[PDB]
Ligand binder design. Sequence first.
Ligand SMILES: *c1c(O)c(OC)c(OC)c(O)c1[C@@H](CC)c1ccccc1
Ligand SMILES: *c1c(O)c(OC)c(OC)c(O)c1[C@@H](CC)c1ccccc1
Ligand SMILES: [Ca+2]
Ligand SMILES: [Ca+2]
Ligand SMILES: [Ca+2]
Ligand SMILES: [Ca+2]
Lengths: 90, 90
Amino acid sequence: MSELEKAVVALIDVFHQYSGREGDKHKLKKSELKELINNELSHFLEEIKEQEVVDKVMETLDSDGDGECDFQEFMAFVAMITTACHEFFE
Amino acid sequence: MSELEKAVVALIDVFHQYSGREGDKHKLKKSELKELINNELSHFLEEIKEQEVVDKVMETLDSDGDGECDFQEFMAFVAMITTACHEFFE
Ligand SMILES: *c1c(O)c(OC)c(OC)c(O)c1[C@@H](CC)c1ccccc1
Ligand SMILES: *c1c(O)c(OC)c(OC)c(O)c1[C@@H](CC)c1ccccc1
Ligand SMILES: [Ca+2]
Ligand SMILES: [Ca+2]
Ligand SMILES: [Ca+2]
Ligand SMILES: [Ca+2]
């Protein structure tokens, strides 16, 4: 596998890890999203401790309004982060 | 680094590898995009041999119409692939 292919499988993998935990196994509810961010982006994002922040983040990512973050909304999240990092460095 | 963080840095890294080669070092012209797909997605995508395919792919990815693929359009490409892979498996 190339680095890129590895990156794609890792994205799918981490999403699966967190989404399968509770309820809809293909969507991230607030607690799952909070755990993903806290455990997997601890070097990029501030750790979420407040409900207000979990709610704001979910609201921002929840494009279809079903209260959860699906795979597409997750990829939209990944793109926001990756694009911010990219613009940041040059 | 988490798997996810590694994934983000890899995305940025591969884009940088191919974009810096020629012309605008922050954008993928057709030849660069072709080489990225051929060398880095050889297990997910058919190898591109025809100009018609390079042109179709570029056209599809080129949202702002500047003839090249920037980082955002690239992330849109990554999302298409990753989302197709994800839907494919469950
Ligand atoms: C984002 C990425 O991708 C990154 O690469 C490893 C690094 O570290 C070199 C970061 O610090 C970030 C950070 C800040 C630059 C970031 C995360 C989310 C949104 C904007 C920036
Ligand atoms: C997508 C992924 O993630 C994958 O895992 C490595 C494999 O290989 C087992 C694929 O073949 C794909 C395919 C769909 C099955 C794909 C490739 C590019 C774009 C969309 C889907
Ligand atoms: Ca879930
Ligand atoms: Ca949603
Ligand atoms: Ca270039
Ligand atoms: Ca463009």
